[PDB]
Amino acid sequence: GSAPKYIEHFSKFSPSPLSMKQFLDFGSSNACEKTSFTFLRQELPVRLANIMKEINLLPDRVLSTPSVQLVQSWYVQSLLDIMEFLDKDPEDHRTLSQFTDALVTIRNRHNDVVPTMAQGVLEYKDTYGDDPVSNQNIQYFLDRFYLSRISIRMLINQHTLIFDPKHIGSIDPNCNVSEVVKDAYDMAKLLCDKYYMASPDLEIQEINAANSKQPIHMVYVPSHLYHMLFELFKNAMRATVESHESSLILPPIKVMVALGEEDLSIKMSDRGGGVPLRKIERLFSYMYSTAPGYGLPISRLYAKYFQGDLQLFSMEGFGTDAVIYLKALSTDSVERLPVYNKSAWRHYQTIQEAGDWC
Amino acid sequence: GSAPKYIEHFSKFSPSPLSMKQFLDFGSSNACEKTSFTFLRQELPVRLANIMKEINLLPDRVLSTPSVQLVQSWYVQSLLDIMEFLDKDPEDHRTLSQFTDALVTIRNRHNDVVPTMAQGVLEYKDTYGDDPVSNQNIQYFLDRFYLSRISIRMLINQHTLIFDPKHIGSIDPNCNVSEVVKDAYDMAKLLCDKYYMASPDLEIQEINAANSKQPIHMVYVPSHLYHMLFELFKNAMRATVESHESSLILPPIKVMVALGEEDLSIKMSDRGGGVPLRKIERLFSYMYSTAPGYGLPISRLYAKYFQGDLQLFSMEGFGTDAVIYLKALSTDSVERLPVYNKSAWRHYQTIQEAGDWC
Numbered sequence A, B: 001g002s003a004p005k006y007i008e009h010f011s012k013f014s015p016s017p018l019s020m021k022q023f024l025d026f027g028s029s030n031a032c033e034k035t036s037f038t039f040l041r042q043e044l045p046v047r048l049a050n051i052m053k054e055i056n057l058l059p060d061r062v063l064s065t066p067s068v069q070l071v072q073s074w075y076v077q078s079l080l081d082i083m084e085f086l087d088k089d090p091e092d093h094r095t096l097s098q099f100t101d102a103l104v105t106i107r108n109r110h111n112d113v114v115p116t117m118a119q120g121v122l123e124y125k126d127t128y129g130d131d132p133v134s135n136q137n138i139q140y141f142l143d144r145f146y147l148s149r150i151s152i153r154m155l156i157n158q159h160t161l162i163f164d165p166k167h168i169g170s171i172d173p174n175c176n177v178s179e180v181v182k183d184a185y186d187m188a189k190l191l192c193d194k195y196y197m198a199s200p201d202l203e204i205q206e207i208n209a210a211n212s213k214q215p216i217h218m219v220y221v222p223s224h225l226y227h228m229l230f231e232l233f234k235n236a237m238r239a240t241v242e243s244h245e246s247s248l249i250l251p252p253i254k255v256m257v258a259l260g261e262e263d264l265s266i267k268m269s270d271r272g273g274g275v276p277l278r279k280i281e282r283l284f285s286y287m288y289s290t291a292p293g294y295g296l297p298i299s300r301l302y303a304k305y306f307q308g309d310l311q312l313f314s315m316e317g318f319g320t321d322a323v324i325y326l327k328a329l330s331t332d333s334v335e336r337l338p339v340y341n342k343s344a345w346r347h348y349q350t351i352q353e354a355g356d357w358c
């Protein structure tokens, strides 16, 4: 009966963002897991507590819903699971071993957090409505919550994958962007053909500004890149196919990979008919995009995770451009993490009722 | 000695946004200027007072600067100039005539508002610094102030131009977008050749979704469209020329004009080398873009004026895409105006000092 105490304790700490460079170190090759165990024993509780403190700051009509209470219980359990190691000592190759076991079990426990929370949004929409202010708070909270989760899963995956070499856990220090683009395209095409029995082709072009014909590589988490590209290819294919089911030409999806001094950008262009500017804004909203998925908003979080971004801009009547912005340098790739503050406390005080424009 | 009273009086009123449809009516052909005079006698004071009330809400260290006090005096004078007609009666073709005179004189009086206010920003940067919160408030205030001005100038131009026919004042009910694109390009090219003795060519392509090969036309204020396109062509040319002064190929600027069910979009693509994502954000800031111009931020206001927008997205190492979003239908083209409220009052209460992210 001491979860609230712990949450209060660790919530007093600020999570420590790691750089892609630091990740390579922690994963080195021989950088013992002792260092990782001692670091994670403190860091995970800090991150868990921080987002838990914020969850408890939600309105009671949101808090008492079955969904929020359910995941709030997974977090509580996960927190206690890790506490068990604070007064334990490395050196014992059994302490470390059961810690890894502990992490995998925590990971599984949280496997369905996204859909579970999505169920809370649907419930709220029918129980209280879909006004702009509700959309803003949901958007504010879910971006932080999901981003926080993405980072906890990163730490955990890094530890379990390494303490089980060219790849350093989920990080590829020599990630060939175009290869990941093709992979995601191929998967999307497979699905596209099963459902539409037709699919647009792919054209890839890259611009290595400083080194003209040298293949573009970067230090990154390939699965994160795959997730984003896969989501974008799915929308681009669907839009292209549906907007041309009475035409016979099916234009290709053109992708450009540009490497600049600090940006490594990936544009995916389609001639899927485009979308009116006003609906674009709703495509990234968890609420407005829930019924009766969250691919875009969540993909954007993965991009923001390492100081990148993901933006959309179409031309109604023509097509849409989707761009993924990543940091080209490993030195600029540092975790973007949310933190509990009075700054964040005041972001849920929206008392809207008549704007500043007419 | 009753300006403060008037400001207080008319600031209690909300400015009335007109639609492109209503503008055509007020300008009809025979829609007497009496209707325009009686409407403008009330509307101009309302708009003037609203922005004046907000100006007086600025910090004293900003208010007392010579620049802000100077334009604040032009507004005061302009307000009193119009008051003179409240208790006057139409029917007298002299009352109306001196009203038109009154408007032109007001227009001239305010001709240098932009640079004058820009001088206030430079002063503030050196007198107090360029912190993010100062940038945010300047950005907040100038967008509203300038947009308010753009709308007052619209009303005035409509009245003076008409009450001096295919054009209805500054509005062309049959504006051929591509023709305006070429015009702006031609002017930019002229300047570009004088300074660089080299300039990229132009390629225009349009997509009329519902009517394939029919020229794209719209009801709009062509000079507003010209201003935006001219600003964008200048940046695209400069970037293209400078990023290739050691190459001999000079790629063209490609412009697409797409007409959708509700959007009429204009994309201007250049291979000017692009800009890193982090600097893009600063390109629209009045403060960060002041030294020791305001083309982009102000052009964006002209687009927002009739419910449109103007966005930028480049690929560092390659080029930049600039898109102007306009409403395709005259029914959706309604003035976007700022209003004085407690909603706007609370937007200047920023007390930043430690954010919500770490």
Ligand SMILES: CC(C)c1ccc(COc2ccc(CC(=O)NCCN)cc2Cl)cc1
Residues within 6 Å of the ligand: A058, A059, A060, A062, A067, A068, A117, A118, A119, A120, A121, A124, A133, A134, A137, A138, A141, A142, A348, A349, A350
């Ligand atoms: C299930 C999850 C994703 C979920 C679903 C729904 C929500 C809704 O959250 C809201 C809604 C309205 C307000 C304004 C207000 O009136 N605040 C004062 C309340 N006392 C604040 C919040 Cl935090 C959050 C999270």
Ligand SMILES: CC(C)c1ccc(COc2ccc(CC(=O)NCCN)cc2Cl)cc1
Residues within 6 Å of the ligand: B058, B059, B060, B062, B067, B068, B117, B118, B119, B120, B121, B124, B133, B134, B137, B138, B141, B142, B348, B349, B350
């Ligand atoms: C010349 C024009 C364009 C100009 C130049 C400069 C500015 C700067 O305006 C600021 C700066 C800081 C703050 C926060 C604050 O501390 N507020 C409390 C102040 N009592 C509020 C405002 Cl409105 C506005 C307009």
